[PDB]
Amino acid sequence: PVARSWVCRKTYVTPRRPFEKSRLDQELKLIGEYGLRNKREVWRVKFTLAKIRKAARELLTLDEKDPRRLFEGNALLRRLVRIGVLDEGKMKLDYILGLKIEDFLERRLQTQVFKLGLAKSIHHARVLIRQRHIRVRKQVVNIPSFIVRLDSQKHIDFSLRSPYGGGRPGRVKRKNAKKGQGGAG
Amino acid sequence: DSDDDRTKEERAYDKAKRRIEKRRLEHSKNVNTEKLRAPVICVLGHVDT
Amino acid sequence: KKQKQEEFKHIAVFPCKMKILPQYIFNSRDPIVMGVTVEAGQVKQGTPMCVPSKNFVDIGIVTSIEVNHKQVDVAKKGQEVCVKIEPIPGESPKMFGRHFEATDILVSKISRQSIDALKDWFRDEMQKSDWQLIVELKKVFEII
Amino acid sequence: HGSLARVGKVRGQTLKVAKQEKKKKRTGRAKRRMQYNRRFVNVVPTFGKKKGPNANS
Amino acid sequence: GKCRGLRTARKLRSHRRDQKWHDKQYKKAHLGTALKANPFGGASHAKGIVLEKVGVEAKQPNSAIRKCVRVQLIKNGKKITAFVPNDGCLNFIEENDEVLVAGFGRKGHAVGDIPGVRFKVVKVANVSLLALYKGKKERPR
Amino acid sequence: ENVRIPGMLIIDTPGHESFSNLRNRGSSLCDIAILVVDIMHGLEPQTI
Amino acid sequence: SEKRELVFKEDGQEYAQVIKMLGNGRLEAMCFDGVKRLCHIRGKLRKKVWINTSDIILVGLRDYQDNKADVILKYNADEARSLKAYGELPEHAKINETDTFG
RNA sequence: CUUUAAAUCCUUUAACGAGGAUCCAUUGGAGGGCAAGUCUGGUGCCAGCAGCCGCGGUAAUUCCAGCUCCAAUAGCGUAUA
């Protein structure tokens, strides 16, 4: 009798077929194009899309003009709009079954920083996110798998402690200066 | 820099061994003259003695 | 080791080469009474007897060893003893002077299992002369 | 020959060689993208059986 | 099904019970004779004592001789035949040694060309046999 | 001098049959040996 | 047919003689030590040569068990009496052109 | 510095701290299922591999060792229910 939780669920899912050409082809294509680490995060993005698709199928199973159907139909559509992946004009319940993995991966923090033009490459963007340089509305984020909301898209900039956004120079810069006045004097 | 060998696993304990025999040596150079340990006596003999 | 002797007494046969004395024959057939002198090895109960010069035909199984009508179990080399030999059941009885004579040197019939049995644990009672006799009975019985 | 049933025969009498230079890693960002663009851009699909990436023939 | 009536269910249930009882894997898994006759006693791994080393012949198309170990089990006390897994590994073990034994992966059946052997050797003398093969660990003295 | 010592350490030892050759862990450490001798017999092979 | 190289014993071989023929692809041979051994047919000797009874056979000894062993190669008549003349076999070994009396 | 009965754990912050950034990522496989070399050298129905087909007979796309390659990745393989 302890005060614990014991509440945990799996986020990714393992596919049924272990070896196949084409599945590996677009999985490697998505990993290479979006700068992902390995297949676990694309499997968990597939699992989140599977959850949303199952909820949409269950909600469309129920008949029209039921208050529960309208209730979490409006809730799910409002959540998908607030993420920003869904367009405002596509305000319909059966449009949930018409988007794919790259739409969810478009709202990643890594590719949002890469499209903002303050980073050179996608892997350079992932390193720059990973190494505590970008704040999200006066709050630094060091992880790449961050879902940027639509309201927070226009408030992404460098950290004030980072040397890129204005601050103290880095460790190798002062070491280079110390070597410079060591060799000069 | 080349101070130790290629792997630090067999070179890291050398400083620890140097400190444990210098602790052994120093404990043998600061010694007391009186109030030493308790000696041992050793009873032996034949059966039915 | 006492129990090992008791249930391995029949399977263990000591080697023995025996020299026959002339004209000391009493019974020629059923049983075999012949006063025969030990020249090599030792004689025990149940030891078979054969002839090497007559393509290895067994004589019979012994019953008792008598030294001047006194039953002695073990007889060493150089003693004139009297041995009562009985024919084996299932085979025909033998007679003296026709099947075998007094001009033949008699040896004990031994088996390779008996040699192995004397090798494994019988180190105490098997001497250097008995080892040489073991080598000779290996070299005469066409066994390796 | 020695004997038929002596264990570790071909393990014992085989020759011994050493290793080579250390390879690098990019955690599959170009480690598998190199074989992807080898199979896509470099190697053309020839009408036949197959054409593998490790085919040293 | 065939007997299709609204107010009957126990006939279907009893027929399904009898037809499920008249099976092979269900009859093996739900009887005490199969677990009693199992040398492992329903365990994945077990420990035993090495007492003999023998060599069995293979099947007809595959002509070789395999090195296998006679092992007496600790929990039960009956002899089995166990097969050492990898090349050059019979010399790594000797007589009168504790050993860890496990099945091949056919749920208690012979695998390949080896007759009468359904178990394999994993660990001997509380050290892994794979580390003994690959030289990662040195054998106890 | 008897006041400064931190007590005394006592080792008892075997010496029956099949025990006289286990003095490696009994005699290689004890400083002052004491030999109890019986005057009825005197010398013994294990004592010498 | 051709006079090949006559091989001697190395570490693990012994000159045996077959005294009784076994079925199911197995063989029984009498080695020249005094004990009994059971023999198995080589995979290279599966049908190329038919080993009969009462002939000199080369058997490979096994160290962890001395009851089961394996044959190697067959000596038929001429290398048999030539190596008999070399003196490895003793006088007690009879070939006598396959006589069954012993 | 903070937390804490008092510390340790996390976070913040001085001074250190990376170029082959040796501050070195393994685990199983490469005939079919089933991603992946008719590569090189050795024993040549022996040693062995192999869940199943089957590979081993002195040209081994399967054994035993080096090079390359694929699979998942701080994780991977085996046996049991």
From Swiss-Prot, chain A:
PROSITE patterns: RIBOSOMAL_S4, S4
Modification Phosphoserine occurs at: S152, S162
Main location: cytoplasm
Covalent link (Glycyl lysine isopeptide (Lys-Gly) (interchain with G-Cter in SUMO2)) residue numbers: K92, K138
InterPro entries cross-referenced by the UniProt entry: Ribosomal_uS4, Ribosomal_uS4_CS, Ribosomal_uS4_euk/arc, Ribosomal_uS4_N, S4_RNA-bd, S4_RNA-bd_sf
Family in the record: Belongs to the universal ribosomal protein uS4 family.
Name this protein carries in UniProt: Small ribosomal subunit protein uS4
Species of origin: Oryctolagus cuniculus
Name of the gene encoding the protein in the UniProt record: RPS9
From Swiss-Prot, chain D:
Entry-annotated residues carrying N6-succinyllysine: K49
Transmembrane domains' residue ranges: none
Compartments in which it is found: Cytoplasm; Nucleus
Domain of life from the UniProt record: Eukaryota
Role of this protein: Component of the 40S subunit of the ribosome. Contributes to the assembly and function of 40S ribosomal subunits.
Assembly notes: Component of the 40S subunit of the ribosome.
Protein name according to UniProt: Small ribosomal subunit protein eS30
Swiss-Prot record, chain E:
Record-linked SUPFAM superfamilies: Nucleic acid-binding proteins
Cross-link (Glycyl lysine isopeptide (Lys-Gly) (interchain with G-Cter in SUMO2)): K36
Subcellular location: Cytoplasm, Cytosol; Cytoplasm; Rough endoplasmic reticulum; Nucleus, Nucleolus
GO MF annotation terms: structural constituent of ribosome
Broad class of where this protein is predominantly found: cytoplasm
Modified residues (3-hydroxyproline): P61
Modified residues annotated as N6-acetyllysine in this record: K134
Modification after translation, per record: Hydroxylation at Pro-61 affects translation termination efficiency.
Residues bearing the modification N6-succinyllysine: K53
Gene3D superfamilies: Nucleic acid-binding proteins
Gene Ontology terms: cellular component: cytosolic ribosome; nucleolus; rough endoplasmic reticulum; small ribosomal subunit
The UniProt record lists the keyword Methyltransferase: no
Region of interest called Disordered, as start-end residue ranges on this chain: 1-25
Keywords, alphabetical: Acetylation, Cytoplasm, Endoplasmic reticulum, Hydroxylation, Isopeptide bond, Nucleus, Ribonucleoprotein, Ribosomal protein, Ubl conjugation
Glycoprotein is among the record's keywords: no
Described purpose of this protein according to its UniProt entry: Component of the ribosome, a large ribonucleoprotein complex responsible for the synthesis of proteins in the cell. The small ribosomal subunit (SSU) binds messenger RNAs (mRNAs) and translates the encoded message by selecting cognate aminoacyl-transfer RNA (tRNA) molecules. The large subunit (LSU) contains the ribosomal catalytic site termed the peptidyl transferase center (PTC), which catalyzes the formation of peptide bonds, thereby polymerizing the amino acids delivered by tRNAs into a polypeptide chain.
Protein family per UniProt: Belongs to the universal ribosomal protein uS12 family.
Protein name stated in the entry: Small ribosomal subunit protein uS12
Originating species: Oryctolagus cuniculus (Rabbit)
Biological classification of the source: Eukaryota, Metazoa, Chordata, Craniata, Vertebrata
Gene field: RPS23
Swiss-Prot record, chain G:
TM region(s), chain numbering: none
Keywords: Cytoplasm, Host-virus interaction, Initiation factor, Protein biosynthesis, RNA-binding, tRNA-binding
Cellular location(s): Cytoplasm
Gene Ontology cellular component annotations, sorted alphabetically: cytoplasm; cytosol; eukaryotic 43S preinitiation complex; eukaryotic 48S preinitiation complex; multi-eIF complex; synapse
Any single GO BP term: translational initiation
The keyword Lipid metabolism belongs to this UniProt entry's keyword annotation: no
A GO molecular-function descriptor: translation initiation factor activity
Major localisation: cytoplasm
Domain of life: Eukaryota
S1-like domain residues: 2-76
Subunit and partners: Component of the 43S pre-initiation complex (43S PIC), which is composed of the 40S ribosomal subunit, EIF1, eIF1A (EIF1AX), eIF3 complex, EIF5 and eIF2-GTP-initiator tRNA complex (eIF2 ternary complex). Interacts with EIF5; this interaction contributes to the maintenance of EIF1 within the open 43S PIC. Interacts through its C-terminal domain (CTD) with the CTD of EIF5B; from the location of the start codon by the 43S complex until the formation of the 80S complex. (Microbial infection) Interacts with human respiratory syncytial virus (HRSV) nucleoprotein; this interaction recruits EIF1AX to the viral replication complex to facilitate viral genomic RNA synthesis and virus production.
Family according to the record: Belongs to the eIF-1A family.
Full protein name: Eukaryotic translation initiation factor 1A, X-chromosomal
Organism: Homo sapiens
